[PDB]
Amino acid sequence: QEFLAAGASFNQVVTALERMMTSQQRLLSDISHELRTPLTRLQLGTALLRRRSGESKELERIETEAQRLDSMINDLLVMSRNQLVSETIKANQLWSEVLDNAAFEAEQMGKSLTVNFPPGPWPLYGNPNALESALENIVRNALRYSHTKIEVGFAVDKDGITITVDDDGPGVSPEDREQIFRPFYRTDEARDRESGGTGLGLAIVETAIQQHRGWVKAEDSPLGGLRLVIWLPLYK
Amino acid sequence: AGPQEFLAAGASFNQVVTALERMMTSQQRLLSDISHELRTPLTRLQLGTALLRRRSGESKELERIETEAQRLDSMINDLLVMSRNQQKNALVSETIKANQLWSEVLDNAAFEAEQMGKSLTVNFPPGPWPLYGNPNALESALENIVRNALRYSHTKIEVGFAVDKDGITITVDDDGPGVSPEDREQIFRPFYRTDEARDRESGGTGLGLAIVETAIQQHRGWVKAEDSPLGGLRLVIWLPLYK
Amino acid sequence: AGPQEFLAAGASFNQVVTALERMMTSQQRLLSDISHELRTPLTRLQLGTALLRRRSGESKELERIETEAQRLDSMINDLLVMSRNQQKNALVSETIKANQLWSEVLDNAAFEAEQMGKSLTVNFPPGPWPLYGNPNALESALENIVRNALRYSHTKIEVGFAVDKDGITITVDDDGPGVSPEDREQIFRPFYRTDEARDRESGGTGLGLAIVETAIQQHRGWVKAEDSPLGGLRLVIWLPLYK
Amino acid sequence: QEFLAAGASFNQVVTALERMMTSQQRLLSDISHELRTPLTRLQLGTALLRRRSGESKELERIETEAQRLDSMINDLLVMSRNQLVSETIKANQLWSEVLDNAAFEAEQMGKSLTVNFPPGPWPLYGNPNALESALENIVRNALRYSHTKIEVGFAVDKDGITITVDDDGPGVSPEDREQIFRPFYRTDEARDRESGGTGLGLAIVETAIQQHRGWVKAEDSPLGGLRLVIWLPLYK
Ligand SMILES: Nc1ncnc2c1ncn2[C@@H]1O[C@H](COP(=O)(O)OP(=O)(O)OP(=O)(O)O)[C@@H](O)[C@H]1O
Ligand SMILES: Nc1ncnc2c1ncn2[C@@H]1O[C@H](COP(=O)(O)OP(=O)(O)OP(=O)(O)O)[C@@H](O)[C@H]1O
Ligand SMILES: Nc1ncnc2c1ncn2[C@@H]1O[C@H](COP(=O)(O)OP(=O)(O)OP(=O)(O)O)[C@@H](O)[C@H]1O
Ligand SMILES: Nc1ncnc2c1ncn2[C@@H]1O[C@H](COP(=O)(O)OP(=O)(O)OP(=O)(O)O)[C@@H](O)[C@H]1O
Ligand SMILES: [Mg+2]
Ligand SMILES: [Mg+2]
Ligand SMILES: [Mg+2]
Ligand SMILES: [Mg+2]
């Protein structure tokens, strides 16, 4: 009872702490509830379109990118009140969809996205969501900060998978190349760029790969821009 | 581990709170990471509507999809800003006296009010009263109550401090329009906006007062929203004394 | 699959609703199964407190544990009853006319009121108006509004029907005590009880009005809780006409 | 737009359906939120006890049976907004804790609970929670409806696991023995018994075992009461 002032009832301290310790969980839990309802509307609209104009490749795209949003809103409502989760996955199962999307988006950008070698049925053990996010972020970094080409190659051996993403955009100067995995950081060249956005991307990448005992590098790219290499280990 | 567990172990007051501060920065990251990752499929969804347009043309349905998407777009952007600020200055509770805590805040409401041709009256000023918490957080919590009262007031704002053995009670009042007794309930919810500020719009995240409630509850105090005698909105913050 | 998807496919009105009815009986089972399985660890927890007692004796802490456990115990029991009823008569929407739907309900409020030495006045009676939904559910939704108004009234109850092209609007009023403008918001929440019925107690699950809101929203209508002119609580139910 | 009356705005039908279809999810989601907060209090009380009276076997029991409650409340808040989930598990991992608890509770009842043969590291694939619930229910049925003894035996072969639970309570007449797996059903003898409770137990058992391609029987028990046999299949 060292927590409120010197004379509060026992019921008073009980409730005082209960508010104190559930406050961020409830904020997230409510932020979660609030994102859900406009998405739910957005989904009813697509339903009502499919009822009228019927099936459509564009529609199906909206229809599923909706579903991705619905899933992640459900992740917030989970891990808010929880405060780690892992399972076994094959690499093709893991990242194929990430790459197919990278393709659809690269085409909309009018940019060439090539996958030199694709992920095989290679054993990983970890968090599916985290690893997808790791790959998607360095790929879409490359999609954006590139001029025209984007290249992605997978490599496997007894020890594990090595993903290599290349672009022909501007490089990242050697000095900046270390600090770009730190949160909210952007190269001086990029905040000057008309591109805007939080420096969170590569920071999410580093913490997902480091939590799977892997590593990430930023390097010179044979394509002229920036090379990003992920390395994860296989599972026994 | 859980700050509740530190409490269960027998750790000091200070340890239990830094444990909480820890769990918070975690939940704070979880928030700003998920926010970051909702933009990805959103961008793709809006690539899709864009292509649906160039094909089947305008639609009552398409228009709904696109505006709920832009709403999601806006909230996520509001959300990233918020936790970027929260994770800018660090979470460090400490002992601090109420007049040190809020004097400079109030002297600015003073000035901001004079710039606006409105009056600010501090009925009773804060005294040298011991609080324990996050000085950036507490500072900011009051500045926002008051900067709001300045905005939504018609002419005058009144800030009032009260101390007793159990703790400090801050009361802020404006002579602007009220808040309907039903919206007085839900103004501390995230993204909530009474339809009136929603009529004027001029932006507005709906997050600020939700931050305040979460922040105060984390200091073991509370907040209420009442009818003000001045006509408009009364906000009350209570916080416990420290020893 | 999801009734939303049936809607997306192009299925009839009737099919979309029986799809919903399906998802409901599922969620209903999920509810009554989880309820059943929370009793297990609760029983064990209360085996534990019982043993803690016989050891270290009474405690402010132990007393808290035991009363929050008995609260959980009570809610789970309230919850099992509820979904047992919901899963007793089946979920079958159908077309039904408003006077067929509610006449017998009202003729009973009449009688129950006369037994209680209170008056019930049906300002405008329900007409032969087409509704589509669950007759057990709709029946029950009104009986509960009215049986409540009988209970919490001081002397008189007033039921009023209104029809127009868009649908039926039922209004129930009692001259009992009100419901504070803040609790008017949260009375449709599960387990909610204004502190006044919580003072008298005499049991009370806090579920009934939550059932009504969920039930009406499922019929595409709505419910509001307003100040009654009669003094007490006004409830309003709107429902759409069918064609 | 066949759903409200003949002249409602498009925004009106959108919201009308959105309420209609999220109504049970939100009821559950809220019923979930409401159970959480008294549990949260109950947990703060135990924390405050461990802070004062310190560690205690009774306390630790309350402390973890709390945690079981917290987990299941989080399951409601999940599967409300979702509308199936399965993974691989070993049988000892699966049901050991269920049995240890059956023991602690049998001791409080002053009844003998014996496990003739225990679950081994035997491969199953399904829902962990569901299968635990299946075993726990027939065991605790036996704990209760018994006079003194309760027996539990596991058996494995190439095809799968066979769990056999025995009690020396009153039997279940052959006729009632089929219908007792139907929901809300109780033998005429049991509603007469001072025992009270919803006839949901065995119904939860049958749907969990049938959803894993298994089966359940109620039979005469060598112990004099009722025998309950579960059979599940192994995993490839
Ligand atoms: N493929 C690339 N080519 C050139 N520069 C890059 C590349 N990837 C990352 N960078 C540099 O690293 C910085 C930070 O990257 P990070 O993904 O962490 O944040 P961001 O991309 O700026 O914003 P967001 O996270 O919202 O996408 C960028 O500002 C950019 O200057
Ligand atoms: N002093 C006030 N008087 C009347 N209404 C208010 C007052 N302050 C806030 N409100 C109402 O409650 C809403 C929620 O306030 P809150 O501070 O939570 O969000 P906001 O001010 O809209 O957004 P932000 O402060 O993040 O830009 C406000 O937009 C306004 O609608
Ligand atoms: N006619 C009324 N007048 C005033 N207050 C009411 C009235 N009806 C309900 N309330 C208040 O709102 C609370 C919630 O009502 P609700 O019907 O949801 O639950 P309940 O009546 O307590 O429980 P149950 O009906 O399941 O036994 C009531 O207990 C009471 O506190
Ligand atoms: N081991 C047993 N011995 C005797 N009768 C049993 C046994 N197990 C089940 N029964 C009979 O089957 C009936 C239904 O069982 P079920 O578990 O489905 O519900 P319940 O045990 O009555 O209630 P609850 O589900 O709340 O525990 C019981 O009423 C009882 O008569
Ligand atoms: Mg990025
Ligand atoms: Mg604000
Ligand atoms: Mg009721
Ligand atoms: Mg049972």
Describe the 3D structure.
The PDB classes it as transferase. Keywords: Two-Componet Systems, Histidine Kinase, transferase. It forms a tetrameric assembly. The entry is titled "Crystal structure of CpxAHDC (hemiphosphorylated form)". Chains A, D: Sensor histidine kinase CpxA. The complex is a heterotetramer, with two copies of chain A (236 residues) and two copies of chain B (243 residues). Chain A has two domains: 1-83, Signal transduction histidine kinase, dimerisation/phosphotransfer (DHp) domain (Helix Hairpins, Orthogonal Bundle); 84-236, Histidine kinase-like ATPase, C-terminal domain (Heat Shock Protein 90, 2-Layer Sandwich). Chain A is built from seven helices and seven strands. Chain A has helices at 10-52, 57-79, 91-108, 128-145, 176-179, 188-192, 201-210; strands at 87-90, 112-117, 123-126, 149-153, 160-167, 215-220, 226-233. Chain A has a five-stranded mixed beta sheet with strand order 2-4-5-7-6, covered by helices on one side. In chain A, a hairpin with a 6-residue loop joins strand 4 (149-153) and strand 5 (160-167). In chain A, helix 4 (128-145) runs antiparallel to helix 7 (201-210). With 243 residues, chain B is an alpha+beta fold. Chain B has two domains: 1-90, Helix Hairpins; 91-243, Histidine kinase-like ATPase, C-terminal domain (Heat Shock Protein 90, 2-Layer Sandwich), CATH 3.30.565.10. Helix content of chain B is 55%, strand content 17%. Chain B has a five-stranded mixed beta sheet, with helices on one face. Chain B has a two-stranded antiparallel sheet with strand order 1-3. The radius of gyration of chain B is 21 Å and the shape is flat. Chains in contact: A-B, A-C, A-D, B-C, B-D, C-D. At the A-B interface, helix 1, helix 2, helix 3 and helix 4 of A face helix 1, helix 2, helix 3 and helix 8 of B. Residues 148-149, 152, 174, 176, 179, 187, 192-194, 197, 204-210, 232-233 of chain B line the site of one adenosine-5'-triphosphate.
